[PDB]
Symmetry: D3
Subunit: 320 residues, 6 copies
């Protein structure tokens, strides 16, 4: 349904961002750095036998306390590499046993809970906090605070996500040389922002990323969650310019252009949640060393368990 692959590979749409993109993010991170990180780990009673699981609490956007899980495989290694895992839309940190892949592969896994979501396919425990009034919005998170980048939901998520990397680095068994940032769909869009904004992340795993190239996304598909923005615009007919202005500060394409760490991307050519031209726009602008795995017959599931093996091999080759 989207551009053919030869064209996708060359797709570099003209970017749109405001003159103060970097200032906005510098100011955002400085204001939240005023609150102590205060990373707290507490060992959890669980039935897990090959992993030690910890409850995590750390200060994200403006000192607000975000939950997570830390999963440490029980191995002979002194320091271990770490994957910081960001979660898809409507998900949250779930149970420790929802995240066994990375620890089973010998990586500590830091799972960041997603403020105010956690109700659509995996439970969450962390609330959101608005900057004052909660404006008229379409159901969901995509238009929550959208009339101002200062009030916009993902300002708070992305800042949480940057602070999560610091929280993971605070656990002493984490090898700070081998902290990886990872996610699919919303988790991939979050990881992309972090790849530009964190100075602690060493590598990026970005699958079927959401939050990329919003302007094109709403022209290409009518699926959720991108349709929340379309549906908001269908009603608020006078707000096009302001909505896209706000979104430009959170667009993965604009972060990709600033990001310098090694990355492995994946895309499903039949994905109609995250259309391939949106994924390719981000990939093509990504300024670090990069590869992409392309799945021509997959929808939003992308490479699934095959991609998971690709990630393990990529990281092994990168860190050796």
């Amino acid at each position: 349904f989207d551009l053919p692959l030869e064209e996708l590979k060359k797709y570099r749409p003209e970017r749109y961002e405001e003159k103060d993109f970097d200032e906005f993010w510098e100011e955002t991170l400085a204001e939240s750095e005023k609150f102590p990180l205060d990373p707290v780990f507490e060992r959890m009673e669980s039935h897990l036998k090959t992993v030690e699981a910890y409850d995590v609490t750390f200060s994200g956007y403006r000192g607000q306390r975000i939950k997570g899980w830390l999963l440490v495989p029980k191995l002979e290694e002194e320091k271990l590499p770490c994957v910081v895992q960001y979660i898809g839309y409507n998900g949250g940190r779930g149970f420790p046993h929802d995240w066994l892949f990375w620890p089973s592969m010998g990586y500590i896994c830091f799972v960041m809970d997603t403020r105010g979501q956690g109700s659509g396919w995996l439970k969450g425990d962390t609330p959101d906090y608005p900057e004052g009034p909660v404006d008229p919005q379409y159901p969901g998170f995509m238009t929550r605070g959208i009339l101002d980048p200062r009030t916009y939901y993902y300002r708070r998520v992305f800042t949480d996500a940057v602070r999560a990397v610091e929280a993971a680095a605070s656990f002493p068994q984490v090898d700070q040389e081998r902290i990886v940032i990872a996610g699919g769909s919303q988790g991939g869009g979050i990881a992309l922002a972090v790849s530009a904004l964190s100075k602690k992340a060493k590598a990026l795993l970005c699958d079927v990323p959401f939050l990329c190239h919003f302007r094109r996304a709403v022209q290409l598909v009518d699926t959720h969650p991108y349709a929340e923005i379309t549906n908001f615009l269908k009603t608020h007919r006078d707000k096009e310019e302001i909505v896209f202005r706000t979104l430009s500060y959170f667009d993965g394409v604009n972060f990709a252009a600033r990001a310098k760490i090694p990355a492995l991307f994946s895309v499903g050519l039949m994905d109609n949640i995250c259309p391939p031209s949106t994924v390719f726009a981000a990939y093509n602008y990504y300024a670090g060393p990069k590869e992409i795995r392309i799945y021509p017959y997959n929808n939003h599931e992308g490479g699934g368990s095959f991609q998971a093996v690709e990630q393990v091999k990529f990281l092994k080759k990168l860190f050796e």
Copy 2:
């Protein structure tokens, strides 16, 4: 798809409410009455010629400033009857010209904007304000603050709505003894709440009501917006009892049981958004003088323009 009509007409399921239902509502309304109502009626340059439209502002839940419209038909009579109109889900106050029916029929019309919504089919101008943290929720309004009645979204909307009647009553040209409360679907549910909670309403028009008999609604249909609650529960599998205890304080069946003012209901027997059994549970418990117009072949549109004429005739008879 629902019970046959002969059974709908007798359907009076055991009600479920907590022992402190009334006290919850007394304390809520009392806390909000500590702020001055401070109703403002500012003439809005519209292009209307047979109606004068005022931009309304008034203090609803916890003094929060709620928007509305006040439309006055161009008639001499020093005191006119008044319809206070509440709005369907994802709607908001829109433009003054969106509400010309009741003014054209000789009634002043007070249209209350809906906090936080106004983004699905008609625009709105009024924000919500949470009680502190914005808990994990499913997209929309149905599960916003659902883990505690003190935090639940409809606490705030219902309080706004009671206060809206007071605001309408403040307008010098409104006949304080001919104040009707009205709405369809979400608007119907809010009106039904108001019909129990306000001391100032003279009659109820309650069309295809939503927010009624939640526990059964979600068994019968999988449509939105009731599906937001199902979908929350599909994830938060441990929260059934808490969710339904919270919803009990906002259930139109429990309000119907307390309401004493005359009412005209309507129902579409093929309505799969507000199932017939949910509307009939509310209607059958409704404690005031009452009549119901039944539309056997209609879905959620109910009686449409036909029902509007039934309303005009009902009020004329009542007020003679």
Copy 3:
């Protein structure tokens, strides 16, 4: 899903029409004009308080008696501007209270009931009368389609022309300020009247239907355009005749003849009336014109926002 906006704005494709288009319509109107208009306005008992409602009857196609409403706002004015309102597919005149917008804005509103429809979303009271009723697919789009002389829209468009003469006959109507308006089917009817009427002074044309039929069926499989496609799936031998008939009714061909000022609207995600069909008509429209473009709306177009634009537009025009 259709051409990008930069291409829609330049989209002026080769028009298809027969050499006798104007003669067809001159002969149609002249034949119907032999019957007296006989416009009848019967004041009616109503619950309305700010508006006076009249039941209307007038002679449309071949003297057939078409219903309407006339809604007159109660204002201290010896003459008032007037909007002649045409109705969307499967609708009809409904109740007087269904049409309160234009009277509330200070316009007399003449609502024309639509022959034979009135059964999908708003009730109607006017029958159709055929020229035999040929084999057709369910609906109105293919009724009489094998010959322009028998086609359903010959009758509707005649009715609609006659409606404006009927409105002009009400004494309080300001004949310098008669507006023709409609959305979707209403807008396709309005485009035809904008070419054919001797009485209309402005056009409001929203998300128009009955435009560029040959391209519409290639772009969408929605109804009501799909009635045409489904007819042709069965009558495999009738492609050329069907498009020949439709060319006499195509809003793109009317637009090219129309001279009055116009305000259009279009939803770029409208899959009932695709944007390239709407832009074909708008771009060929020969009078002074403007268009409001709603990039995120489907067939609802600009909704209540566009209603505000209309009132502003007519106020400027007529001041």
Copy 4:
């Protein structure tokens, strides 16, 4: 989705008809018999080799001229049994070769075209003739529904009775072995003819439509029964008048009067013609009768399996 089979078999709900049901039909048929039948059989140049095909024209309702095909298998016998075939909703007579089953089984087949339809899945050549064509929902189900004298099926069912007279006029037809047959709309028409024709000798009634309307619209939201629901959703003041009209055309009411031997079929998962509507009709049917029950089939019913059952049923019936 409907009643379980044990209950369907006992389902014999209270019938609804007006006091003048028989009078309505007697006068309808009397009036149409005033016009000469004038059945015209024109040998049609054909590529067919085992069958002789004829173009048929005959006088149906009020003398209106209806098309058909006559297909005669090339056999030695002087007189042949005959199946009068009625056609499903949105179909028409199509081509001669569309109807080869019955001829191949040694039966002359008279295929009646369906007035005004012919545009959904197979083409047709016969027009309808109404005077005013009232507001209606798209299609045939609500055409003229506010009065049984104007209703579309009054004309179809008359045409269908006249068809049997026309088939019987063909010299090679054995008038002792005239079968009336159809599926869905075809079946509902055949059910009416089983009560109204004095010439039909046996009925093949598959997955019948036009039965138990009031219950059909409560059970399913499919077309074409949904045309009726959608008309009532708009004309909310007309529920009584619509069902009164429909009572004169209801297969259940015809079934109670029909005397000829019949073979029915039903699909238990058919959501076009719900099984309760079909069993209501079957259970009231007053002639010698059998029903083939296909529990896993939708509207296709027994398909080719049923065709074999019909052949066997008629062989045994006719000795």
Copy 5:
């Protein structure tokens, strides 16, 4: 939804086949020729009166016994032309009375049952006989797809070549007028036979399936092509193996080799067999050829209109 027609007419994509395409088919066919054909025609008791029906069995792929019907019109001519009919996806030979068209037009019809299918819209009676039956997606499209030697259509296409020899062996068949025919799956089978058989005289290829697989799975998400997509969505490591296997069975590669006169049909709105897949095959077809193009039709194609075109085409070819 596909290429516009002017581009379809010129669509001649680079073909993909392995170096050993012809050798694979020569060895396949030589191996199956080592088993005796042993055509068996058992005359059946039938209700049919204009046609003689035979129960057919013959040896297809590797001596496996395949069912069929032979329908002989009762005609004075002692040698008759013959159409060997292949059946659409999920069908099978059904009953003899399912196949009356060609015998009514004076052709012997040999209907080939389809191994292992017969369970979706018409029953069948013939099993498949594979070795191990590899992991597969539900259906026939992926059965044995990891190796052309194990692939399901190797066996169907061999059956189909053998069916033409079985038809030829019936004494009343005129071996100079054997036609091979099908639609959709039947048309892809017929197209393979048009390249592989030395006995067929003409090809009727309607809306052909089993063409240009690589592109089909990009254009549509419908079944049955979506079985291939779904297999690849799971077996993410097997893209190259899958399309290599499929290249031995692609109608486009057979069309390039076929020499006999052909009449194709295509529906421009067919989203089961997309127009670009059909035209790729049609444009490579190396024999004398024509195509009937149905711009408004989906997968039904020309339906009964095309059946007429077929009968005319063969009459002209053979006279």
Copy 6:
């Protein structure tokens, strides 16, 4: 959409099985046990660090070689309890890392690959081995359904009984602490194993499929149950035969014979495995049992909540 919870808890429909049910299974398992099990475990080079992964091969139905995974957590305890895991419809054994749950909780996990499937959502490596593969609807539900001796699940259920013996042969498995587990198709397979094998200590049976087939096809039209309905729609003469065969594989009949303690789960909104089908099995389940009821869940059931419940249930059992 199904019975209310109060009725589901009381739903014990009359069972249907043939008089030779036990004999059929006795002979089936005896014939397969004549071939050596020959379990082979090969340590796999793996990226996994907390788990030792082994490629498994073993003899299932009639010596046929079935793949699997053996996942051993790296722990001190020399003899570990073991969960034998059966896979959902269209799945297969996938990668070792797809099955980390049970090993992470301290259990050796034996994952049985599913013959012939492995192509819908997780890839598989094991073929099926039928002679003739009868006419069937796409998928596995109707493969060999005309005889219980040839039916697909005869083979799978035998494989699954043999998997328990193959897990028991691994030296680090505590052969006295083996559990059988599955969701949907995996739950139906585990249920059969709960009746057929004497080795298992406990059953984990989530949203079970393969239960109460006769009722399943009346209640939902979803796949995979709809493959059966679809087969019956065409093979209209095979209802009795199809249900007789299925009675030998019906989870409700195996439940009646199972004695080991069980934890079931059910989604009350599951329209793949309807609640009445799951309750019919659960209600007839003869051993100590409990059911987790998820009223707001569809076929996902309890998901990770249910997994926690399983870990607790086994912990109590093996203390």
